[PDB]
Design a binder for this molecule. Structure first.
Ligand SMILES: Nc1ncnc2c1ncn2[C@@H]1O[C@H](COP(=O)(O)OP(=O)(O)O)[C@@H](O)[C@H]1O
Ligand SMILES: Nc1ncnc2c1ncn2[C@@H]1O[C@H](COP(=O)(O)O)[C@@H](O)[C@H]1O
Ligand SMILES: [Mg+2]
Lengths: 547, 539
């Protein structure tokens, strides 16, 4: 009885589908760049985020249409795992074929049925070598006439059909970066072209005799006509930023990413197997993966989960492990009578950033409906607030305690902690990146709401990234004047909380003489509604060719 | 509205891209298996890929009928369900084949009450987004611009003396175009390559403002991994035969057939859309538009349906028209092994020596275009399941093929080189099949026909078998000497046959050419007049 193969054939055409439109979507971004539609560029991720669930939220449904006889026991919930697996030996996109299965089970079963043979949480039996690259995935450009002519190839064999602005002036520029340290090093520009936002990214590795290093060649336009490749990145420091966790991922038309995640593995050395599925847009395998990498850490170190650094939230419950890169954000119950019927506003702000353009000042997350936590890895201190600030939200499960719809984002260093830790030349850029963080947030349609110091984070290189997502609304959702009543915003009212430190508030003037002032916030909301939103540069406004 | 209206219409459009996307998973897996030279698989990837559609329609059908519990498929729900189907097709690039895949499902659920209200079986019921091709300009020589185009090709095997080719491609162009006229004549080349059999073609268009003309450069290697181009192909008439109908399916990776079909158009302005779709394997948007071409054609024509000329088949009852270029092949009943035999060629690498077919179980004709000369021949000899309905009939399990002219007949409207020309090909029609693991059980002039550009093909798989179920014993069981009785029967035609195709008669080509299959070999079919290869007669 093909009862549990009709299924496995069904949940695996869900994927084959989910990925079906994935790459048509991804493959509209070349034209949509010639074409002038950036309403379209900002709304396409928003279609990419949806397909995966758009395709499980049918196989999930059409499953139940005949899932009545022996509908469930794990007896046969397992022949689905076998039947499904046995069907993926030259399935090169198998890692994500498996990954589609997971979120389904977990949807039919409250993200909650048993582990490890009750799901694909690890890759099965390929597994390890990703040399799943039948085609080259990039071409090998070697210097014969070198660096005035060969790099002419790149710009000429681009499928991009538009009068360039000065290729020949770009050629003179590019060598200026190259001479920092040539021609005994080949070139390997990649295919296809990496797209995000108002930009196009020419990706490549400049292999040099000393060593091999990244080589990024981003393409731009004079909005809305004439285009100029701009700025020449080749640095590990730069590769990591562009590809950062505070900026939205990529439109790379990749029907094999597990291999592509292998090519860039040497463009972005520090990056994780799950940071590399994020970028290409396969964020739903980052999640199986992050967790895959996560559950290695604590199942291999010392000691337990603690409460995160900084200030305790009015809403969220935040924990982490002192060695680990990531934070877990659990929501409180408020009290016993208060009933979690849902919409949630909070889950809406966390989602309504799941699709938004973050631009470097906002960081992404993961969602699990029921996460099983080690009762033995739990401090007894973390537990006490955890137990009774989220009681309705969890359940003791014998040796384990179960928690529902938890959020995970890159651990950071709370700003207000660090603001204290620094002063001097350092203290300069901790305010600048702050206001800049609040200038760019605004332009993205993001007005921070509670804009206090500790709701943002920082990086090793030193940068601010917001992470407080209830007091968030669209810029067209607030009205701006404090002259002398719900939701309205008073821009100078902000002069109280933020200039409070008489070491840092003075220095606010030095860089942000107008964020205090109301006029300037109609400016940004108002210029968002003319159809215009300035997109982001993946570098310092100081590197640009323009200055 | 908590029903199947939405559940259902998107339950279909899912099997659809669940289907096509894996179509390209293999369609692009071909370079790596040609590259590897794993050509056995090249023949199973032309089985696999042929399978995909059929499985996804079969799957939804299981899903489809299951979702709406119990028996009934309703008609005004079949409209309800359709109205939804289009409103999701608008941002669809491959929406052309989304309407097709709709149809195969209605037919799966015995095609009763077949259309126009209830499905969209035509060209389209009602700006290129990306890279399609690329340009190359004779600015710095053509000797330099035949190494350029090439260093943007996928292949990872190392070309051995690519030096000759660049200089060897010039001439086909030079003696035909004129060294003055190839100063400013440039190239348009498709970003991906057409992979068939042992081949990895390069399909581009040559641009000479002395017209707009095709350009075709097959990539061949043998044994260890040598690479070179097996002739150059430029004039219009070559292209038919490389994209031709006796052929096996083509293997080019495009996620957007409409551009790819449409791009290739001007190369040979040769006929239609169903031919130019199927040349990629998208035969199931061919099995549709060939219903359009079926419908349009007879709209302003005063013809009728008649039997196709030739010597009435033992094999199979056939009808057709005066100016129609395709033949209808209702299988005789009470002479199924044809169901299965007729698609062992479909399944097979057709060699150009075999015709494509398309199968309709329940198929409709206006009996007015039917003349009762042919009525009772259909009404009686194909009557097992005849359904007559006042002014219309529906035929069951009927195949089709382009209607070439029959050979026996071709031979009298022939003499001169014409006979030396036409006979040569026939024996080479029998030779190809063996090498292709194919045996003609009745291999008579009766059952072979002639192509536009004078080729003979084998459209009688009715007594077919792989040559690996047969013995050709010297003196199932076959007597290659006695074929001359029926073969060498005319004192105008035969003798020409002892001149060239004398081996066909001796069991030693027969037997000893089999040992060459069940040893592993794959036969070098070619898609050119052989004389055309660069080494032969050129160098
Ligand atoms: N990504 C993070 N990096 C560092 N600390 C965090 C992070 N997320 C949450 N925290 C800690 O948990 C607290 C919860 O912050 P937030 O997300 O603003 O919820 P609330 O608005 O309830 O404070 C923060 O003040 C912070 O100190
Ligand atoms: N009995 C039929 N009547 C009309 N059209 C058909 C029939 N069978 C197949 N087709 C067409 O050919 C395509 C291939 O479907 P199928 O070969 O039946 O999977 C379908 O999408 C239809 O457009
Ligand atoms: Mg806070």
């Amino acid at each position: 009885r093909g009862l549990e193969l009709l299924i496995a054939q069904t949940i695996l055409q869900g994927f084959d589908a989910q990925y079906g439109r994935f790459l048509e979507v991804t493959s509209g971004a070349q034209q949509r760049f010639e074409q002038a539609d950036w309403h379209a560029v900002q709304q396409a991720m928003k279609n990419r985020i949806h397909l995966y669930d758009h395709h499980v939220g049918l196989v999930v449904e059409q499953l139940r249409c005949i899932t009545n006889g022996q509908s469930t026991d794990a007896e046969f919930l397992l022949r689905v795992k076998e039947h499904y697996t046995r069907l993926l030996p030259d399935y090169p996109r198998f890692e994500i074929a498996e990954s589609f299965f997971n979120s389904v089970y977990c949807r039919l079963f409250d993200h909650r049925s048993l582990t490890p043979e009750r799901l694909f949480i690890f890759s099965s039996q390929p597994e390890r070598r990703f040399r799943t690259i039948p085609r080259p995935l990039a071409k090998d450009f070697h210097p014969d006439h070198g660096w005035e002519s060969l790099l002419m190839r790149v710009i000429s064999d681009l499928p991009l059909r538009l009068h360039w602005q000065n290729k020949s002036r770009d050629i003179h520029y590019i060598i200026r970066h190259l001479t920092e340290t040539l021609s005994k090093s080949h070139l390997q520009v990649a295919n296809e072209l990496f797209y995000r936002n108002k930009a196009a990214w020419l990706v490549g590795k400049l292999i040099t005799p000393s060593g091999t290093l990244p080589f990024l060649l981003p393409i731009h336009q004079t909005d809305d006509g004439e285009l100029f490749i701009d700025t020449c990145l080749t640095t590990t420091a730069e590769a990591s930023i562009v590809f950062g966790f505070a900026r939205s991922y990529f439109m790379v038309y990749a029907p094999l990413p597990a291999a592509l995640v292998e090519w860039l593995r040497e463009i972005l050395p520090g990056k994780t197997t799950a940071e590399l599925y994020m970028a290409i847009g396969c964020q739903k395998h980052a999640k199986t993966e992050s967790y895959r990498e996560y559950l290695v850490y604590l199942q291999g170190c010392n000691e337990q989960f603690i409460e995160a650094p900084g200030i305790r939230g009015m809403v969220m419950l935040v924990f982490t492990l002192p060695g680990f890169d990531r934070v877990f954000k659990v929501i409180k119950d408020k009290f016993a009578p208060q009933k979690e019927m849902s919409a949630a506003h909070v889950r809406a702000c966390y989602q309504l950033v799941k699709e938004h353009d973050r631009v470097g000042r906002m960081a992404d997350t993961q969602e699990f409906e029921n996460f099983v936590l080690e009762k033995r890895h739990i401090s007894p201190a973390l537990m006490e607030l955890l137990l009774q600030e989220a009681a309705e939200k969890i359940t003791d499960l014998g040796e384990q305690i179960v928690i529902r719809h938890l959020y995970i984002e890159r651990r950071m260093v709370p700003l207000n902690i660090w603001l204290e830790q620094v002063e001097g030349q350092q203290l300069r850029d901790a305010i600048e990146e702050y206001g800049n963080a609040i200038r760019q947030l605004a332009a993205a349609n993001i007005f921070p709401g509670d804009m206090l110091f500790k709701n943002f984070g920082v990086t090793r290189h030193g940068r601010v990234v917001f992470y407080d997502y209830d007091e968030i609304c669209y810029m067209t959702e607030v009205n701006f004047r404090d002259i002398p009543s719900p939701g309205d915003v008073f821009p100078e009212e902000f002069r109280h909380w933020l200039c409070a430190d008489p070491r840092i508030g003075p220095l606010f003037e030095e860089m942000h003489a107008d964020l205090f002032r109301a006029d300037y916030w109609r400016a940004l909301q108002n210029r968002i509604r003319e159809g215009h939103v300035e997109d982001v540069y993946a570098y310092r406004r100081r590197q640009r060719f323009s200055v």
